[PDB]
Design a protein around this ligand. Structure first.
Ligand SMILES: *[C@@H]1O[C@H](CO)[C@@H](O)[C@H](O)[C@H]1NC(C)=O
Ligand SMILES: *[C@@H]1O[C@H](CO)[C@@H](O)[C@H](O)[C@H]1NC(C)=O
Ligand SMILES: *[C@@H]1O[C@H](CO)[C@@H](O)[C@H](O)[C@H]1NC(C)=O
Lengths: 524, 524, 524
């Protein structure tokens, strides 16, 4: 008979699922609410606690994903899911749910390390249910929790003042971690041992939670995969009013005051707000006009409740793993953003492209020829220059900020680890050219045990996933990924040792060292 | 000058009305609020206390009745009113009011027994103001309180979970009883002595209040006239989600989650919700398709706040009077539901009709020929078979559940009385054929003293009302209807004595005994 | 390969279907348009010709039925369909289509008699596709055409003046007959030989077409089954303004002038107009208030284009067959109208019921006791009195008007035939009691060959259908139903011979003779 667990708010019923090679089934619970649905007047306000229920709640069907572009959403889900078949999800504003995969013995009080996954998707798209926790939970004996949080307008609308501070989706992430603290023990999890992990906007979310006083003591280790808060495209600093005014005008609202914009947006239906989103054309490199106006998405702001100062100002202490992939801009991102690419580049085109990429990389027009010349100037081949140009964007968006974050964290005295992931999963899209290796998202298939759920993995890819899961879980359990029978992974100290993970797994030193000196010198 | 009374929330002004034969006038107060109007976000939530007022509130005009089909509402009001002329009422969502008839001396502190009336109308229609308390109050010296409660979608919409538990109209009934506890003393009533009474959906409401921990100690005696909670068409058990989804779809709302349905219904106007009600065609026997889909009304659910388990589960202690009429299905009900009836019935037609009557009687198709044969098999006359067929439905809906309720109540040690009312009031509709005697609703004219308010009563009908009022009020005052100069009414003990009331009033024994054995044996 | 026919407006493709016992298949064409869809500004205006099409139109799926109550519509369709399974239809304003069943040899120029069927349903509900023409077409070798026409508000909204004259659904019937004149030859039909036939509102439609100068020469014989125009509930005389004002108010329109009501109704969506229909509660005997206000449906008016004077005024010449069934009010009609019926009746209840039946029978209150006493006064049995009461309504609505129409038609010199149909089809509803014989609609199963399409007919019922089809078709072909091997059917001359059809088929004389003398004497 199926597993039934008592939680503070009432009982929940899930399901037992087996995995070849494990004699104990995993108990799976889908669509557990962790907050009141943020509808009606709750739109653009902090999450409220869920109301209790009097009878058993069924937690056996996937929850809706937060409102978002359903085509971009479905497409990102197919690209990143570790399951055999993608699970088609419904859209809704009622999306504050989490899913739990627990291999514990639910009769006997276990206290397994808890890993709370935060999905990516630029804070605009994405879903928890894309990520099946079964393989990680069963192989490594940890409770996997996948969470959702408000996206896009619903998640990040900000007037830059007290009428709509912003960061609703981050406060959701915080409320899901409070829920874990209060309830995970009934699922066989140790609330005394919670690791947050996430990729891309999810990695940026981990990073913001590492910086935020609201999240202090709701987790004990942190992992950012390909995304941190510092200097990110996902962080909006200075005056955010002009974006709020455009969103309100696009929705047909007056812009007379902040409170007027918020109240009027609060009267719109889900559909009207989705139509507004559609008209703003987020997540597309805008090729027309002055690149300084282009507005690629909504994001984190400095709201004064979750974040008090800019990441850079705070910079000036849990174990923290910060990693990046070898080709962060190799394919997936330029292809989701409609980057204009022949697959070759002369220097002048490269400059115009970089200038157009201003909202992604923020390089002043005066500095464009220098920057371009630095990355492209060593070679003749316009095919290579194209590669070197993709390298440049990757380093600015991901490689440099991640290494700057890791160094500041190390210097503040906390345990720090870094990796650079370099592997071509056999689960890549068929449209992805062979030469792309360690694209954005490539490490998800290892971390989530896709070789144990999907067909066709090579022997090497199977062993790669076992090793990455074991490092991840050893880090969840001990704040140090090392253990018997694994390559040594050095702590990121003054030597800046890091692990190269993938096709040939080995320790190395000084990740992005010369890049960080170059960009830092350039911007200051 | 008119009577003015102080209540917790402020002063109220009513009116003195005289009745031929009493030298003291009765003070009447119409349209006293007992809760905040349940509008806007208060829709589908528990009643809130009324806000206080600073100056005298006028309580001299009838309140609106709860939103409902205005034609079915007006028609039921004319059929059941004990007044000379029916009072045309306005519809509104703002309908949480009660009316008070007090014969007390408002200068001198009286403490009269209080009888709180709960109207019927299938939880879909009905109004307090239909029932004029003047004659009962004056003849028997009791404070009569008629209350309203939310009806239909407004009153009973349930998603089967915490987002819209349901039973809003019952919580209203509870809030009106709290109001009585706190305020009735200023009207000359004893809050230490409150009897609830009601007919049909009103009798079912009394019964639910008898079972509910929320109503404990808000009343001291109970009367159910023709309706109890156990096995009722008015009680919806198991999964109530499919009905909620139909109502939401009919209203043009998405059904993605419970909270989504509730929020969207909360945005509809009163008119849109009335149009939805109209499109669902409640209170009409659906003659097309599979009778197991037919959905005749909304109703009580097991919501976990008012009711914790099914009546049957609880079954497994105030004085309680449970009664039924001789022909519960003789006319009024089949005529309000458009029952298809020639006034004669062969056995095969009877079976098809019973199968179509599934939402009223819930008899499985395999058991239909047995059940039909049991009631119709002793006779040739298809006119009689038609009578016997009406008997069968009455016994299933009213006679058996009432006797099962009374027996369980007796066995739990509480004082229990039963009656079977058999009289043809001269206030029956002109369209009601002569041979119908003790139809559903026939006892209301006695209980409410219609011979003292309307013209044309026979001497016997006049004496019948005096006697019934006196039994009712003796029961309100003592928890035992007996007194000097009345026929003896035996307590319902192991002998199952009950009173036959009407054309020849006398004690008898074993009401519906062989029927209860038959149906119980049949269903188990 | 399937049959393809050229019509004035373009080619149409249908399908071959076989019937056991005929070696030639019948060609069936479903959903042929005969007018422009009456949408947008075409609402409440005369039908316009269909626009031509350039490529083959597929005529192999049932068309939508006109907008109407979908539950009452579906229920009437199941009750009256001659097919094995009822075909669920879509609702739409775009409903001006006809269906054709032709047994002709489409290569070889045939010219078969054409029978154009007009469905009933009180001018409020009904559909062409309910009636499968296959069996009649194949057995009798005629082209069967089933037509649709606008219903309810769409079909009959009238301001009583030139801004919305009314009778839109009748003008539709006329336009379908023009289409037949112009196109039927391509389907193997003789446009020189078109018989109109219809039942109930369909029989009333035939009758109106017999009276109308707009329909002169568009048909050559006529059959009315259970419904004529004279004195009908379906004919609205005098001032029709008050009904138009109620419909406009119910729809939320101002009533300042006729043109204002029409323009505002023309802005409403299909759904809003269906909601208005639902709120007026048509086709239900209204049991409350003064029966002279009750408004049971929309109908034919004297619009000045289709009808110039009242039927009675015109009364003061194609072969015409006028028939009625033995128990026109026995079951189906009182059961669709929620007639309040115990199945027995004392005289005073009978009077109140008759007075309530005013919109059906129009008997002044002063004349009620006389009328009632005339039909019920010969007997004691309240079961019989109930039968005799049903007889009275039937005679007033159907038997007397039909015989008055037939006599006037005879006296004007045209060939006239009458029948009274008395049979209990085995295809009756299971809820229909055994004793009802020749109910309203019972003859449709014979006329449409239901014993050849549905299971279970007795040998007698099979022979009854063959005989009725053959009389109907002999009448279509010759204007005289007689032929070799059939019972003799006398022409309705001064002797008033008519055919009793059913359980024992024989000539008789003087149908409803004493009834016509009684009611005529009563009303004048
Ligand atoms: C829970 O809901 C699922 C739908 O996903 C259903 O199949 C199942 O019967 C439900 N379980 C219980 C115990 O009601
Ligand atoms: C109370 O209102 C009624 C309307 O029902 C009115 O006739 C009366 O004047 C009012 N009484 C006072 C004291 O204002
Ligand atoms: C006509 O439409 C029907 C749908 O009812 C379809 O099955 C058929 O293929 C169509 N015929 C042609 C010739 O396109």
């Amino acid at each position: 008979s199926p597993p039934v667990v008592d939680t503070v708010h009432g009982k929940v019923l899930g399901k037992f699922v087996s995995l070849e090679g494990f004699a104990q089934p995993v108990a799976i619970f889908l669509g557990i609410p962790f907050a009141k649905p943020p509808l009606g007047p709750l739109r653009f306000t902090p999450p409220q606690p869920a109301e209790p229920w009097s009878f058993v709640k069924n937690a056996t069907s996937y929850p809706p994903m937060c409102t978002q572009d359903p085509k971009a959403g479905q497409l990102l889900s197919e690209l990143f899911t570790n399951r055999k078949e993608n699970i088609p999800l419904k859209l809704s504003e009622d999306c504050l749910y989490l899913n739990i995969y627990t291999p514990a013995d639910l009769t006997k009080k276990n206290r397994l390390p808890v890993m709370v996954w935060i999905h990516g998707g630029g804070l605009m798209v994405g879903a928890a249910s894309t990520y099946d926790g079964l393989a990680l939970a069963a192989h490594e004996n940890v409770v996997v929790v996948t969470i959702q949080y408000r996206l896009g307008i619903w998640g990040f609308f900000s007037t830059g003042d007290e009428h709509s501070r912003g960061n609703w989706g981050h406060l959701d992430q915080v409320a899901a971690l409070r829920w874990v603290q209060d309830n995970i023990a009934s699922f066989g999890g140790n609330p005394g041992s919670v690791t947050i992990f996430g990729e891309s906007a999810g990695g940026e979310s981990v990073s913001v939670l590492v910086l935020s006083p609201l999240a202090k003591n709701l987790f004990h280790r942190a992992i950012s995969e390909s995304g941190v808060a510092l200097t990110s495209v996902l962080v909006k600093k200075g005056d955010v009013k002009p974006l709020a005014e455009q969103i309100a005008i696009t929705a047909g609202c007056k812009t007379t005051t902040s409170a007027v914009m918020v109240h009027c947006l609060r009267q719109k239906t889900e559909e009207e707000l989705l139509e507004t989103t559609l008209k703003m054309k987020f997540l597309s490199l805008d090729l027309q006009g002055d690149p300084r106006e282009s507005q690629p998405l909504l994001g984190t702001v400095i709201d004064g409740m979750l974040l008090l100062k800019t990441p850079e100002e705070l910079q000036a202490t849990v174990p923290y793993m910060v990693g990046i992939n070898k080709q962060e801009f190799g394919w997936l991102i330029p292809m989701l953003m409609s980057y204009p690419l022949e697959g070759q580049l002369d220097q002048k085109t490269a400059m115009s492209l970089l200038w157009k990429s201003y909202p992604l990389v923020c390089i002043a027009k005066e500095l464009i020829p220098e920057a371009t010349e630095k990355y492209l100037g060593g070679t003749d081949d316009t095919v290579k220059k194209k590669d070197l140009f993709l390298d440049l964007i990757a380093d600015v968006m991901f490689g440099v900020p991640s290494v700057i974050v890791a160094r500041n964290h190390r210097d503040a005295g906390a345990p720090t680890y870094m990796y650079e992931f370099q592997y071509r999963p056999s689960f890549s899209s068929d449209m992805k050219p062979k030469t792309v290796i360690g694209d954005h998202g490539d490490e998800l298939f290892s971390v989530f045990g896709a070789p144990f759920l999907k067909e066709g993995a090579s022997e090497e890819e199977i062993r790669l996933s076992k090793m990455v899961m074991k490092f991840w879980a050893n880090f969840a359990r001990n704040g140090n990924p090392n253990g018997e029978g694994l390559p040594h992974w050095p702590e990121y100290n003054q030597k800046e040792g890091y692990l190269q993970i993938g096709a040939n797994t080995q320790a190395a030193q000084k990740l992005k060292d010369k890049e960080v000196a170059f960009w830092t010198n350039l911007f200051a």
